[PDB]
Design a protein around this ligand. Structure first.
Ligand SMILES: [Mg+2]
Ligand SMILES: [Mg+2]
Ligand SMILES: [Mg+2]
Ligand SMILES: [Mg+2]
Ligand SMILES: [Mg+2]
Ligand SMILES: [Mg+2]
Ligand SMILES: [Mg+2]
Ligand SMILES: [Mg+2]
Ligand SMILES: [Mg+2]
Ligand SMILES: [Mg+2]
Ligand SMILES: [Mg+2]
Ligand SMILES: [Mg+2]
Ligand SMILES: [Mg+2]
Ligand SMILES: [Mg+2]
Ligand SMILES: [Mg+2]
Ligand SMILES: [Mg+2]
Ligand SMILES: [Mg+2]
Ligand SMILES: [Mg+2]
Ligand SMILES: [Mg+2]
Ligand SMILES: [Mg+2]
Ligand SMILES: [Mg+2]
Ligand SMILES: [Mg+2]
Ligand SMILES: [Mg+2]
Ligand SMILES: [Mg+2]
Ligand SMILES: [Mg+2]
Ligand SMILES: [Mg+2]
Ligand SMILES: [Mg+2]
Lengths: 206, 155, 226
RNA sequence: GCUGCAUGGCUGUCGUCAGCUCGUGUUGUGAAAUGUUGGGUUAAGUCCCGCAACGAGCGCAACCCUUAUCCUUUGUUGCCA
RNA sequence: AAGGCGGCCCCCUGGACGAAGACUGACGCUCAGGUGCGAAAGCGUGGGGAGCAAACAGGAUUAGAUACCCUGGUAGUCCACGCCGUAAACGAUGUCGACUUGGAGGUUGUGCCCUUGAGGCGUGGCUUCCGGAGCUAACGCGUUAAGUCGACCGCCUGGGG
RNA sequence: GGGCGUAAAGCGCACGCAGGCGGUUUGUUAAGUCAGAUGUGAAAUCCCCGGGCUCAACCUGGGAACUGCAUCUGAUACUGG
């Protein structure tokens, strides 16, 4: 059958909300749209910047955007010229001033976004999917993954019929609520269709 | 110091409700180059894992063979389920003349001069078993001398 | 150890003539009222020498493991092993206990850790929930692997109280090359056994006699080494 | 606008049914088997005993929410011995 | 011997096995061709024919139903004498001989033991079941071998045609 | 130097002529069997040791081989008479 979203089910318990701001019904949808605009614009032109997580905060008189990525050098540029241009555009998106705080991830392969986007990107670069998923799994275990599972599905290898392919090493206790599963999904636009990639990473409990 | 080499690798299948479940088998032979030779058979999903398993399986279950001088004491005939094996000692410098599976077994054991032919089925798993059986049942004149209580004037 | 001692203890009985093993012919005198008789004139001389080489294996500071799972001699084999400071199995011989010693040792360390952190250690964090669960795990592991907790290695030799009824242990010993000191009855099979001891094993006084002989030899080995 | 019979995502279904596997060991020439079967028991492959199996994992269960009782903390916009 | 043989009785007749001797003295085993026997169905002639039942008929069923189901029903099944010589004629395992650990039965003899007895110890023949070594591709066979061996005969050589 | 329970393959069964095979002891024979010798088994070829075309193919000396046949003498364990 179908599975619940592991981030969504454990959102209230162990998973900090991406959006951690409060208001009334008057500006709920309005600021929700602004978060959508910010995130989609940010992702589209930082597709190479290995963007992993975007945390939008709304203090009473501004917006704060925390970008968890693996390549701070690219996203800042020289002397911070790029972060100021992103400041101009992001602030103009929401019509309020914007603070930008850039957090770095030392282990990219233990975060479910970097592994997912890398596996997807290899597909349109024509890397065979079996080897790609195996490379991801081996990287996670070497760099200290307690459990890994990767799901590559849809039009594998230019075949006529879509097939499901998954490979699990380690430990993925999804039904355990205290378990810490970082989940992400990424997509691959290939000449023979579109491929879904799912990654579960278990990194201990409580 | 001891030698090890791989005989064959085969992909096997076990179908389940989802479909096939592919596996890989490895046949290897391990010998010290003197006449102490063994074989190991292992199964795994990956070829490196399968060959490694067969490696430890061969280090245990080692046997001893009494060799005259880089060759067999006498002609020997080793039979397993479907494989018939005939080996006879040859002269110095003639080298190894045997099939694929038998040559590897023989060369890791330490027999340099041998004429060996395989009849019946040529399945690697069974010809290796038949070759090991022959190297067992071959005997030495001194053990025969004690066996018959006749000392070593026979040779 | 003597002719009359074993005869008085009644080890000369064997099973019924409906359970015999055609490999027992050298060690059977006759059948009276469908009860085989084990020739003491044959079993004693090879009993003494088997005990003799048992002394020799003990001389090398060996580890002797006493295997009996029959309810007849449960407490019998336990006290005999502990008295001479040797190791034992009594509840049930776990399949692969010798061959799969790595996984067994994992369970043994798990066993070992629990006594020292629960009983003589700390009793904090009960939560009143898993205390009974954890003590039950202790008891299960104590009856199963309690007798081999300190070995830290493979036995040097085995003493078996029934070849046929512990054939699993016998085949593992043969595979690992461990010398076997097994008592064989009429219905048993001595092929795997290395130093066969023909005798009865259904009598408590008989089994205590046999365990006393091995106990005297092993303590003599220790004292001679001293 | 066409092709869900090219697909991703999402969903229904058996069904919250209790199953799905792996490591080492052992067995079998081998594919594989055993473990997972059997006597009971349980809501459950839940647990126990036996058992060439010893363990382990995903599922069962537990952790999350609410309701059922009490203790402590703050008392307004709620309560009045 | 196989095919096969089932109420009871009488007449004629074959083989088998057991006990203790006597007797012949290798007279033995196997067997190409040859000969004889050989279920059922079928064929010839003459009988017999209750039951059953190919064919055939009718009624159902069915999209159709030359069938399965139902109601009937001739040959045939029965006897005598010939012919046929075929079967999953099977143990799918040629005949003869020797050797190789065991256990429980069935069936038929036979020697003994205080025969005391409504009790046990031996010895044969035939016959089922389980299983050891061994053999087998495996299933399995396993003293009644598919084990270890000898004698001779028959047969086989990819699937169709 | 293969097989026939189930992969192809034990005649449906038996009797039985030819044929194949044959328990055990002594004597004799010497057909099979074995040993020795003698005569043949052409040359070339094949193989070994050499020789000559500058090498090689090629040619060539000797040897071995052609252990097959026949005869004579002898042995008598086994087979046959
Ligand atoms: Mg759901
Ligand atoms: Mg569909
Ligand atoms: Mg395993
Ligand atoms: Mg094996
Ligand atoms: Mg199952
Ligand atoms: Mg299974
Ligand atoms: Mg099963
Ligand atoms: Mg059960
Ligand atoms: Mg349930
Ligand atoms: Mg469970
Ligand atoms: Mg179990
Ligand atoms: Mg649950
Ligand atoms: Mg008829
Ligand atoms: Mg007629
Ligand atoms: Mg009718
Ligand atoms: Mg019949
Ligand atoms: Mg026929
Ligand atoms: Mg036939
Ligand atoms: Mg005949
Ligand atoms: Mg059987
Ligand atoms: Mg053939
Ligand atoms: Mg057929
Ligand atoms: Mg056939
Ligand atoms: Mg027949
Ligand atoms: Mg004769
Ligand atoms: Mg002659
Ligand atoms: Mg010539």
């Amino acid at each position: 059958g179908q599975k619940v979203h592991p981030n969504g089910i454990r959102l209230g318990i162990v998973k900090p909300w991406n959006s951690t701001w409060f208001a009334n019904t008057k500006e709920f949808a309005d600021n929700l749209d602004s978060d959508f605009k910010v995130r989609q614009y940010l992702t589209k032109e930082l597709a190479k910047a290995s963007v992993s997580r975007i945390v939008i905060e709304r203090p009473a008189k501004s917006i704060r955007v925390t970008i968890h990525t693996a390549r701070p050098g690219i996203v800042i540029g020289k002397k911070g010229e790029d972060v100021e241009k992103l400041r101009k555009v992001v602030a103009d998106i929401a019509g309020v001033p914007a603070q930008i705080n850039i957090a770095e991830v030392r282990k990219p392969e233990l975060d479910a976004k970097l592994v997912a986007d890398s596996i997807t990107s290899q597909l349109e670069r024509r890397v065979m999917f079996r080897r790609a998923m195996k490379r991801a799994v081996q990287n996670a275990m070497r760099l200290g993954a307690k459990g890994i599972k990767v799901e590559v599905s849809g039009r594998l290898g230019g075949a006529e019929i879509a097939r499901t392919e998954w490979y699990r090493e380690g430990r993925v206790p999804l039904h355990t609520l205290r378990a810490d599963i970082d989940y992400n999904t990424s997509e691959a636009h290939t000449t023979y269709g579109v491929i879904g990639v799912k990654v579960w990473i278990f990194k201990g409990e409580i | 110091e001891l030698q090890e080499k791989l005989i064959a690798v085969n992909r096997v299948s076990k179908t389940v409700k989802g479909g096939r479940i592919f596996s890989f088998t490895a046949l290897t032979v391990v010998g010290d180059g003197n006449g102490r030779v063994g074989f190991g058979y292992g199964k795994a999903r990956e070829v490196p894992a399968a060959i490694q398993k067969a490696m430890e399986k061969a280090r245990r279950n080692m046997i001893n063979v009494a060799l005259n001088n880089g060759t067999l004491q006498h002609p020997v005939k080793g039979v397993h389920t479907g494989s018939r094996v005939f080996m006879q000692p040859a002269s110095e410098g003639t080298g190894i003349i045997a099939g694929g599976a038998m040559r590897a077994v023989l060369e890791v054991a330490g027999v340099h001069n041998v004429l060996a032919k395989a009849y019946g089925s040529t399945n690697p798993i069974n010809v290796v078993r038949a070759t090991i059986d022959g190297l067992e049942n071959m005997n030495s004149p001194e053990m025969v001398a004690a066996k018959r209580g006749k000392s070593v004037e026979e040779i | 150890v003597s002719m009359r001692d074993m005869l008085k203890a009644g080890v000369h009985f064997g099973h019924q003539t409906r359970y015999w093993n055609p490999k027992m012919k050298p060690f059977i005198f006759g059948a009276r009222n469908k009860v085989h008789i084990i020739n003491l004139e044959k079993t004693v001389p090879m009993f003494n020498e088997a005990l003799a080489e048992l002394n020799k294996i003990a001389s090398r500071k060996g580890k002797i493991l006493f295997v009996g799972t029959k309810r007849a001699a449960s407490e019998a084999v336990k006290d005999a092993a502990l008295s001479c400071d040797q190791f034992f199995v009594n509840h049930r011989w776990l399949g692969g206990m010798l061959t799969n010693w790595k996984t067994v040792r994992q369970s043994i360390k798990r066993l070992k850790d629990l006594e020292t952190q629960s009983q003589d250690g700390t009793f904090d964090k009960l939560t009143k929930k898993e205390a009974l669960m954890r003590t039950r795990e202790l008891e299960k592991l104590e009856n199963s692997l309690g007798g081999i907790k300190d070995m830290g290695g493979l036995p040097d030799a085995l003493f078996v109280i029934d070849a046929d009824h512990e054939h699993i242990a016998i085949k593992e010993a043969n595979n690992l090359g461990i010398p076997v000191f097994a008592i064989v009855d009429t219905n048993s099979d001595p092929d795997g056994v290395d130093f066969v001891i023909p005798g009865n094993d259904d009598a408590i006084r008989a089994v205590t006699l046999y365990l006393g002989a091995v106990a005297a030899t092993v303590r003599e080995g220790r004292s001679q080494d001293l």
